[PDB]
Design a protein around this ligand. Structure first.
Ligand code: MH0
Ligand code: MH0
Ligand code: MH0
Ligand code: MH0
Ligand SMILES: Cc1cc(C)cc(C(=O)N(C)[C@@H](Cc2ccc(-c3ccccc3)cc2)C(=O)N[C@H](Cc2c[nH]c3ccccc23)C(=O)O)c1
Lengths: 145, 141, 145, 141
């Protein structure tokens, strides 16, 4: 669990985050750094180069959707499992997405936050976000069967 | 790296499998789908019920690929080249899953080779399956 | 979480286990298959070969003790965290044992159970035990800090 | 395997780190100890408080080892042979931990390289650290 001081740190930093932009950046980097994750987006078009992926309008659009749901979750840190129950079921039953992808995205997101915030993304702040991305990934994986 | 002893150990244990290839391959897959449900995300097009035709057929393919690897244990990267291309460019199974199937393959062998599954052989087989997994994911990025 | 039927399968199979023997065999195989785990037992003597390791009296004795605690924990599947809380703090503060080791032993134990029970260790029974060893490992790593 | 582009990206990124390599090494270790407490089991003899002399000194050794690998990026198995022996035969850090330090090194670099930490460089650095980790655990068994 996060300490009261960690929750405040998470919430404080997130208030400065442009969710749409970070979403496109995080999803795009996921597809570039771990190319096999492109397997779920064969309808998105050109993903043959880093720029082709990062600038792909469908990737940027989907990134908004993804981090948008992530952002809402940050407003319910005490009930991540309930918050992501319907999305968990959807990702398992309809999209067939291996939960490991959520973990990979979490790590990429941490890297993106560090890249954007620089020194402000202190070791303690990172530790707080590691608990957050882990919690979100576990919540999204909870309804798999 | 696989030592002469590992190679000898693997060839002896896998040689005991023989005609039981498809059966053990299918059992390993079933054990994986039941113990690690997330692996089923890669087979939505499969009927994964006990004894399904698709699982049986896939089990035979996996087992035969391993039989071929064993025969070419000196140069698996070359023997598994096509298979490596397949998993890296098409199937794109996340790397973390290979350890799950390898573990279930070991369990399957252990449950069928009471005499051959010695501590030393156990170790060699684990290194072997890890080596195969490494080759199969060597071209992912 | 061990369906009522999974709990029964676990208890039913474990009631047939010689904990002393299976423990020494499990710890021994751990040391053989993952040699780096030998780092915690330099005072146990000869570990130069598989047979040296398996026949090592200190290895067998420690395996017996470890699995004995494991065994007692199987009677309280509903509160593994509580049951192993003390051992958790111990392995962290005194022994300094990376919890990954608990996961490795868990896998080896499953292999040993398979080797001993043969066909009786069915895919469903395995699934139930995978939940048990993961639960025990998680419980033992719970108090780490 | 590292491509020509990967090597160009790694050399460019690590070159920018330059004189701060040691500082970044210490920072990456600190991030690791705070985010993944289990890694502290390998340093019970260390004062792990912020800015401790031991962490500073160790961060320097780790960073220098990475600098050496970049200088010998086409011969890492040999350049890191001594370090590989040390971790495989003495330290015996479980393999799972290398990914944790690698991640923290990436986060540290991202926090200090606003301009060079592009998606392509991020990808190359991740492959590089994984390659170094692989070499360091190649002789474990
Ligand atoms: C690399 C795989 C992958 C990762 C990682 C992933 C991570 C996440 N996701 Fe989610 N998601 C993935 C692959 C998809 C697909 C394939 C789709 C459907 C896209 C389409 O329309 O073609 C999807 N996700 C769809 C969604 C949708 C849209 C639901 C709908 O269409 O009804 C949302 C809100 C979403 N996700 C959230 C999230 C969240 C939150 C995370 C984690 C923080
Ligand atoms: C959890 C996922 C997963 C893991 C791990 C995995 C691990 C392995 N695999 Fe491989 N493999 C996986 C998922 C697949 C799929 C989804 C398919 C395609 C099935 C189908 O028929 O649609 C596949 N693998 C297909 C194959 C095929 C058949 C290719 C063909 O038809 O030409 C073989 C031989 C194979 N693999 C071998 C192996 C071996 C050997 C290992 C490792 C020991
Ligand atoms: C490879 C490392 C390793 C693994 C795996 C491991 C796994 C486990 N352990 Fe535990 N344990 C390990 C290394 C030790 C050491 C080093 C000692 C001290 C031995 C000695 O002779 O001084 C120890 N464990 C000591 C113990 C003791 C005695 C503690 C005491 O004196 O009060 C118990 C009961 C114990 N463990 C239980 C367990 C249980 C339960 C598991 C998991 C199923
Ligand atoms: C979580 C554990 C852990 C991980 C991961 C790890 C990952 C790595 N390491 Fe390495 N290393 C770890 C734990 C140690 C210890 C405990 C020591 C001993 C430190 C001391 O001063 O007693 C050590 N590593 C010591 C070293 C030394 C010093 C050896 C000497 O004095 O001659 C170097 C250069 C080193 N490593 C580099 C690296 C590199 C490079 C990586 C990977 C990027
Ligand atoms: C049924 C179940 C499974 C598991 C794995 C864990 C728990 C459980 O109740 N936990 C172990 C909680 C506990 C927790 C409590 C306190 C702290 C803490 C830290 C610092 C200061 C103060 C408090 C950290 C974790 C936990 O956070 N996660 C678990 C489940 C879980 C985590 N990783 C997994 C991987 C696979 C399956 C399950 C899990 C959960 O809360 O449910 C319950």
């Amino acid at each position: 669990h996060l300490t009261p001081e960690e929750k405040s740190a998470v919430t404080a930093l997130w208030g400065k985050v442009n969710v749409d932009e970070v979403g496109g950046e995080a999803l795009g980097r996921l597809l570039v750094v771990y190319p096999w994750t492109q397997r779920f987006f064969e309808s998105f078009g050109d993903l043959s180069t880093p720029d082709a992926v990062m600038g792909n309008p469908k990737v940027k659009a989907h990134g908004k959707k993804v981090l948008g749901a992530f952002s809402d979750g940050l407003a319910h840190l005490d009930n991540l499992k309930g918050t992501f129950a319907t999305l968990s079921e959807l990702h398992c039953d309809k999209l067939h997405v291996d939960p490991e992808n959520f973990r990979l995205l979490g790590n990429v997101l941490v890297c993106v936050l560090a890249h954007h915030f620089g020194k402000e993304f202190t070791p303690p702040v990172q530790a707080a976000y590691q608990k957050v991305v882990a919690g979100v990934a576990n919540a999204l994986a909870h309804k798999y069967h | 790296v696989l030592s002469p002893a590992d190679k000898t150990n693997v060839k002896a244990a896998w040689g005991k499998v023989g005609a039981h290839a498809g059966e053990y391959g299918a059992e390993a897959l079933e054990r994986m789908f039941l113990s690690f449900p997330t692996t089923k995300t890669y087979f939505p097009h499969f009927d994964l019920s006990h004894g399904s035709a698709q699982v049986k057929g896939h089990g035979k393919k996996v087992a035969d690929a391993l039989t071929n690897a064993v025969a070419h244990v000196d140069d698996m990267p070359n023997a598994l080249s096509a298979l490596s291309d397949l998993h890296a460019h098409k199937l794109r199974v996340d790397p973390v899953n290979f350890k799950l199937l390898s573990h279930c393959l070991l369990v399957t062998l252990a449950a069928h080779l009471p005499a051959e599954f010695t501590p030393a052989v156990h170790a060699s087989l684990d290194k072997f399956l890890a080596s195969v997994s490494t080759v199969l994911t060597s071209k992912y990025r």
